[PDB]
Every structure is written in C-alpha cells, then in structure tokens.
Amino acid sequence: CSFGGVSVITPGTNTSNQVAVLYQGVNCTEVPSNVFQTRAGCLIGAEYVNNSYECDIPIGAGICASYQTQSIIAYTMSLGAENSVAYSNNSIAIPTNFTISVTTEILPVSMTKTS
Amino acid sequence: VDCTMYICGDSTECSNLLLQYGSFCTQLKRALTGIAVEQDKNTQEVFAQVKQIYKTPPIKYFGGFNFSQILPDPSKPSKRSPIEDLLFNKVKFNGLTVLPPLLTDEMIAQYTSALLAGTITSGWTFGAGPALQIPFPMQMAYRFNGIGVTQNVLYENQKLIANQFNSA
Amino acid sequence: IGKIQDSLSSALGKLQDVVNHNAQALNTLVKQLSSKFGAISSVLNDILSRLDPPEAEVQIDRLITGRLQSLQTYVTQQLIRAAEIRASANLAATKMSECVLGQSKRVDFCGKGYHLMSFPQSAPHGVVFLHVTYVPAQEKNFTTAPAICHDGKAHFPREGVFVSNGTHWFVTQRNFYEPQIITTDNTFVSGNCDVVIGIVNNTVYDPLQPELD
Amino acid sequence: KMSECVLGQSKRVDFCGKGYHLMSFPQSAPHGVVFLHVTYVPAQEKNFT
Ligand SMILES: *[C@@H]1O[C@H](CO)[C@@H](O[C@@H]2O[C@H](CO)[C@@H](O)[C@H](O)[C@H]2NC(C)=O)[C@H](O)[C@H]1NC(C)=O
Ligand SMILES: *[C@@H]1O[C@H](CO)[C@@H](O[C@@H]2O[C@H](CO)[C@@H](O)[C@H](O)[C@H]2NC(C)=O)[C@H](O)[C@H]1NC(C)=O
Ligand SMILES: *[C@@H]1O[C@H](CO)[C@@H](O[C@@H]2O[C@H](CO)[C@@H](O)[C@H](O)[C@H]2NC(C)=O)[C@H](O)[C@H]1NC(C)=O
Ligand SMILES: *[C@@H]1O[C@H](CO)[C@@H](O[C@@H]2O[C@H](CO)[C@@H](O)[C@H](O)[C@H]2NC(C)=O)[C@H](O)[C@H]1NC(C)=O
Ligand SMILES: *[C@@H]1O[C@H](CO)[C@@H](O[C@@H]2O[C@H](CO)[C@@H](O)[C@H](O)[C@H]2NC(C)=O)[C@H](O)[C@H]1NC(C)=O
Ligand SMILES: *[C@@H]1O[C@H](CO)[C@@H](O[C@@H]2O[C@H](CO)[C@@H](O)[C@H](O)[C@H]2NC(C)=O)[C@H](O)[C@H]1NC(C)=O
Ligand SMILES: *[C@@H]1O[C@H](CO)[C@@H](O)[C@H](O)[C@H]1NC(C)=O
Ligand SMILES: *[C@@H]1O[C@H](CO)[C@@H](O)[C@H](O)[C@H]1NC(C)=O
Ligand SMILES: *[C@@H]1O[C@H](CO)[C@@H](O)[C@H](O)[C@H]1NC(C)=O
Ligand SMILES: *[C@@H]1O[C@H](CO)[C@@H](O)[C@H](O)[C@H]1NC(C)=O
C-alpha cells in the first residue's frame, strides 16, 4: 500500500502553534496550501525557498526547516563559509598578533549505582 | 521497525492481545531511534572538521608535485575525484524502513575536497586558526625538519622526491 | 576566564542525558509491574483470592515470565550503557594526564589552537576541562625564497623563514612576525647556488669582519 | 586520525602508516573514509665506525 511514519515539525509552543507534517517516504499524491516532495517523504505546511541557511531542524537528505519567512521553511544546509587562500609560488602569510582563548569540554565519568 | 506491524501485522485480534505486554514496543523503537541519530553524529564528527570551504587556485601548479588523481573532477555531477570514483564502484516490507542520511555524499565529497585544498595550500595552519598560505616546497621542507632531516636534503632532491611521490 | 562564567551562568547536555536515560529506564521498569501479560489481573492478592491453588499456578506463571523478561531487558541495556560510560571515563583519564599534567602536541586534543595549558573542574557525574590555547591573528603577506645566494654559496635559515617587505630581506620565526638581519649566525651553508630552485641574490652579513677591522 | 594526521604532523609511531609521517590525505568511501599516508623510509645504509 503506502504505510510510513508521521512526524510533526514545530518551532516550539513558546514561539508559535503552527506546525508542519512529514509523511515519511510516502509519495505526496496519496496522503489523504504547501505540498512539497522530498527524498525523505511528503512535507505539508512549509514553503520551499531558494535561499540556503544553516541547518535548524533536520528533515533529511540535505533538507532542513526553520520558522523564519511566520512559519517553517525548507532548504539545503550549508557546509560553511567560503575562504579563498591566495596561494602562489613565492607568497607567505605570517601573523603579527595573537589571542589567548579558553574553551570548555564536558565529559561523563560515572552513572548511578542501582541494585 | 514498527513493532506492532511486525508482530501482529494488519490483524486486530493480535493488537489487543499485544496491548497486554506493556511498553515492550516503545522501548524497542527508542533503542532503534537512538542508533539512527548516532549515525549522523559519527559522520559530522569525522568530516565536518573545517570552518570554510577552501578552494585550490586555478593555475594548479604546486612546485611540481601532482595531485590530479585526488582533486575533484569538474566534469561530473558528483564532483568526486578519480580515486573516489574507483572506491564507489567497489563497495518495502513488514514494518521495516530505511531512512536516508542527513548528508548526501556530494556533501561529503565537498567536505573532503576542502580538507584537501586546505592542506595543499596552507599546510597545518588552517587546523589551528586562519589559513596562511605557504609555497608547497617550503611546507615540504618544514615537514622534513619535523622528522629530523635537515631541510637542504629536500631542496637539493626536490625533483627526485616529487617523482617518487607521483609514482607512489 | 570572565566569559566562561557568563556563558555558563546564563550547555551541560551530555551530563543531563546520562541522568535522563537512567531515570527513563528505572521508570519503565516499575511501570511494568502493572501489566497482565495475559492473566486475569496484575495483583497476586487478586489471583490468590478468586482462584483455587491449581488454577492460580497457571496465572502466576504468566506474570512470572513477563516480569523476568522485563528485569532481564533492564539488565542488558545497563551493561550496554555502562560500556559506553566506561570509554568516556577512559578518555577523561587520558585528557587529565596529557592536558592537565602536561603540554600536548596532538592536534585538537586539548582544545582548538596551540595547547598552552588545561584546568580541571568537577561536575555532578563528570569533569569539565578549561583549555587555554594560543591562536595567531592579524596576518600579513610577504614574499619568500627558500635560500639566499651569496659568494656562490646557498644559505638556509637555522630556525626561521626568509621574508621580504618589498625591498629588503629578513629572517623571522614562523609563527610571529619579528624580522632580523640575515647574518652567518642565523643561517647555515650547504652547496652552491645553482641546484635550489627559487634562490635569490642578497648579502649575508658577517659580524666579525667589520668589528675586528 | 583526521585531526592528527591530516590537520597536523604526528610523532606517534605507526599512527599514520609505516615510516616517518610526512603528511596524509583523506578520501571519502561509501560509509567510510580512506587515508593516504605519505611517509619517509630510509634506504641504502652503510656501516661506519
Ligand atoms: C594586538 O591585539 C591587541 C588586542 O587583542 C591590541 O591591543 C588592543 O589595542 C586597542 C587599541 O589600542 C585597545 O582598544 C584594546 O584595549 C587593546 N586590547 C587589550 C586586551 O589591551 C594590540 O594593540 C595589538 N598589537 C598590535 C601590534 O597590533
Ligand atoms: C598528473 O598525473 C597524471 C597521471 O595520472 C597526468 O595525466 C596523464 O598524463 C599522461 C602523459 O603525461 C597521459 O598519457 C595520460 O592520458 C594522462 N591521464 C589523464 C589526463 O587522465 C597529468 O598530466 C599529470 N599532471 C601534470 C600537470 O603533469
Ligand atoms: C595577500 O595578498 C593577496 C593577493 O592580493 C590578497 O588576496 C586578494 O585580496 C583581494 C581583496 O581582499 C581579493 O579581491 C582577491 O580575490 C584576493 N586573492 C587574489 C588576488 O588572488 C590577500 O588579501 C592578502 N592577504 C593579507 C593578509 O593581506
Ligand atoms: C622595509 O624595511 C626597511 C627597514 O629596514 C625600510 O627601510 C628603512 O626605512 C626607514 C624608514 O622609512 C629608513 O629610515 C631607513 O633608512 C630605511 N633603510 C634601512 C636600511 O633601514 C623599507 O622602507 C621597508 N620597505 C617597505 C616597502 O616597507
Ligand atoms: C645572482 O648573482 C650572480 C652573480 O652575481 C649572477 O650571475 C651572473 O649573471 C649574469 C647575468 O645573467 C651573467 O652575465 C654572469 O656571467 C653571471 N655570473 C656568474 C658568476 O654566474 C646571477 O645572474 C644573479 N641572479 C639574478 C636573478 O640576477
Ligand atoms: C655492515 O657490516 C656487517 C658485518 O660487520 C654486515 O653484516 C654481515 O652481513 C653478511 C651479509 O648479509 C652476513 O653474511 C654476515 O653474517 C653478517 N655478519 C655477521 C657478524 O653476522 C652488514 O651487512 C654490513 N651492512 C652494510 C650496509 O654494509
Ligand atoms: C519562552 O518564554 C519566555 C516567557 O514567555 C521568554 O522569555 C523566552 O524568550 C521564550 N523562549 C523562546 C525560545 O522563545
Ligand atoms: C508519485 O507518483 C507520480 C505518479 O506516477 C509520479 O509521477 C511521481 O514521480 C511519484 N513520486 C516520486 C517521488 O517519484
Ligand atoms: C528557484 O530557482 C530556480 C532556478 O532554476 C527557479 O526555477 C525556481 O522557480 C526558483 N524557486 C522559487 C520558489 O522562486
Ligand atoms: C614561479 O612561477 C613563475 C610564473 O609566474 C615562474 O616564472 C617562476 O620561475 C616560478 N618560480 C618558482 C621558484 O617556481
């Protein structure tokens, strides 16, 4: 037939009560506005934009959703900025200053002893 | 796996009887969902180790050394390299489903090519901060110092060393 | 150090997770004491009150089997969760040795940057490391050469790089810009200047030659 | 390995191949990664007093 899980995408009830719905790996013509077909299923209640942001809520196969443009949106995540090294056969870059930085790292060591 | 659809499966005399077992099926779905969320974090931790998406310069001439078999192939939809193309040619049911990974392998190939261009252009500086360009022969000479060889041994043998790399 | 205090006072999800998983499992264990598993009730004082002993054995066994199954599932998942906490504690013990009682050279093992030092802090069921690292900043480009030719000889820097500000040639150390005059005290010689590719012509200054004379 | 053999030079013996680690290059495989380790191997020794 065409079974599959149903997932609900929400920006959080402390932001809004709108919702989008993913029918997982179901063809979006046999579900029963915005109907959008994904490699991960049929998405209802979000509009597809052409921009690309950092991932917010992961849908799958490169698609994420966000509450931005008010409602939720889809798109393809961003790997990162774009840095272009001016490499040449006789050029070098050398630093003239520094910063002292300090970061944290958290690790579990134990859990509770039960009998 | 949908526990209820694997066990009973359509029938209704089976669902009411299975309802008598408590939360055995909720535990199993939690266990399988944790596994699936861990598989994306595995890949994020191996490959997304870079701030920017670095590119190699067009001229593409690093004092000789030849990296063409491991740099990306612009005439492809996937933009994989020649060796990444060699590696990729060698490797519905009763409630069962396969989810897709969050990262396509186009994205993974794009992370790996940026890690490669960071190394060929900046040595090890992009792994500790901003990428600082250095010529490749001089970076190779810094690395010869790190193994305890004096750095004129590289500059006086550059062509032989580059040929050996290329043959290997 | 003043910003760690703000960012925390205003992130411990890996410690909160461990706690949540154990509580969610202990609650599922108790919530199973109220399932029939195919019996007339969930209470032994109800099978021992409306059944004669030959008929209550069959109903008590159905509860025994279910409760044993549930207890043994609890005990398997705890073994699998403890084997994961064990590896995390083994990594924490290595970081305490290599980042707190030493200076590490391994890249990205004791922070991001160049490791200077680390400080431990205790947490509810774990440990926080505060990593202090050096990060270089504010880079300039110069032009470089691998060696300098002078008097028919090729000179290489002892511990630096040859750089040019446009018209003059100096030696710096590689991570911090601090230019010096190229002399025979910060360079060494090997060979003649026609086998290296990229040599430049420049003068290498001898300190004795003038001073003596 | 990606941190210590690709983003730096390692002095740990045999962590990045056989020989003295020079540098390493990553390639993506299906469900995995391949590391090409470049090392320096000494050759043609003579004996001395
Ligand atoms: C190196 O960077 C530091 C900043 O980290 C510079 O010091 C700052 O200088 C500005 C302008 O003089 C002041 O407003 C800041 O208060 C200074 N920061 C600190 C922490 O004191 C320093 O001048 C830079 N050095 C060079 C040579 O550029
Ligand atoms: C880098 O190496 C490759 C070999 O893997 C070179 O490409 C080959 O070059 C030979 C002649 O030198 C040709 O016969 C082959 O057909 C080439 N194979 C190709 C193009 O796939 C390549 O030229 C080298 N790069 C440079 C700059 O010399
Ligand atoms: C090092 O020099 C290069 C060469 O100009 C600089 O890189 C160029 O910067 C301009 C302006 O930011 C860009 O429009 C070019 O695309 C860059 N790349 C080139 C020309 O190949 C770079 O800014 C210099 N670095 C520092 C730290 O001053
Ligand atoms: C490169 O650095 C040198 C510094 O040695 C500069 O030359 C000196 O500049 C100062 C101030 O302009 C003068 O008082 C000196 O007479 C110059 N010569 C010497 C031998 O010290 C030079 O201008 C710098 N070049 C560039 C392009 O910045
Ligand atoms: C570096 O210096 C050497 C020696 O001063 C230069 O060698 C001379 O180059 C000229 C022009 O090519 C020739 O006419 C001479 O016969 C060369 N003499 C020797 C002893 O080789 C060399 O050309 C200089 N390099 C540059 C780039 O100017
Ligand atoms: C250095 O000299 C030693 C001998 O002192 C050489 O070792 C001998 O090697 C030959 C050939 O393999 C064997 O037949 C002998 O039995 C070895 N000698 C002993 C005492 O066992 C060694 O091969 C020489 N190495 C070089 C690079 O010259
Ligand atoms: C949650 O609600 C509180 C008060 O209603 C507000 O201060 C806070 O910003 C909200 N959180 C988010 C993420 O909107
Ligand atoms: C859904 O069915 C239609 C009708 O056959 C088909 O054109 C479409 O490609 C199907 N969906 C997908 C994702 O292939
Ligand atoms: C996104 O860009 C493509 C370019 O091929 C265009 O065809 C499409 O209409 C755009 N989508 C929207 C929603 O504007
Ligand atoms: C660097 O490349 C230039 C081409 O712009 C060439 O003229 C020069 O000989 C090269 N030098 C070295 C050291 O490779």
Numbering used by the authors:
A (entry chain A): 590 to 621, 640 to 676, 690 to 735
B (entry chain B): 736 to 826, 854 to 930
C (entry chain A): 931 to 940, 944 to 1146
D (entry chain B): 1028 to 1076
Provide the authors' original text about this structure.
The BA.5 sub-lineage further evolved into BF.7 and even BQ.1.15. On another branch, BA.2 also evolved into BA.2.75 and BA.2.10.1, and subsequently, these two subvariants recombined to form the XBB variant, which has now become one of the most prevalent substrains globally. We then employed single-particle cryo-electron microscopy (cryo-EM) to determine the structures of trimeric S proteins in complex with ACE2-PD. The structures of ACE2-PD in complex with S proteins from BA.2.75, BF.7, and XBB.1 were resolved at overall resolutions of 3.5, 3.9, and 3.9 Å, respectively. For simplicity, these complexes will be referred to as BA.2.75-SA, BF.7-SA, and XBB.1-SA, respectively. In these structures, the RBDs of the S protein are all in the “up” conformation and each one binds to one ACE2 molecule. Besides, XBB.1 displays mutations D339H, V445P, G446S, F486S, F490V, and R493Q when compared to BA.2. The monomeric human ACE2-PD exhibited binding to the RBDs of BA.2, BA.5, BA.2.75, BF.7, and XBB.1 with binding affinity (KD) of 4.80 ± 0.01, 3.2 ± 0.03, 1.2 ± 0.01, 4.1 ± 0.02, and 16.2 ± 0.03 nM, respectively. These values displayed heterogeneity compared to the WT RBD (12.5 ± 0.04 nM). While the increased affinity of Omicron BA.2.75 and BF.7 subvariants for ACE2 may partially explain their enhanced transmissibility, it does not fully account for the prevalence of the XBB.1 subvariant. The hydrophilic side chain of Ser in XBB.1 may disrupt the original hydrophobic interactions involving Phe486 of the RBD with Leu79 and Met82 of ACE2, thereby providing an explanation for the compromised binding affinity observed in XBB.1 and its RBD.
The Omicron sub-lineages harbor multiple mutations in the S protein compared to the original strain (referred to as the WT strain), which mediates receptor recognition and facilitates membrane fusion with the host cells. Despite the extensive mutations, all these Omicron subvariants still utilize ACE2 as the host receptor. Binding of the receptor-binding domain (RBD) to the peptidase domain (PD) of ACE2 triggers conformational changes in the trimeric S protein, leading to exposure of the fusion peptide and facilitating membrane fusion with host cells. Hence, we characterized the ACE2-bound S protein structures derived from BF.7, BA.2.75, and XBB.1 subvariants.
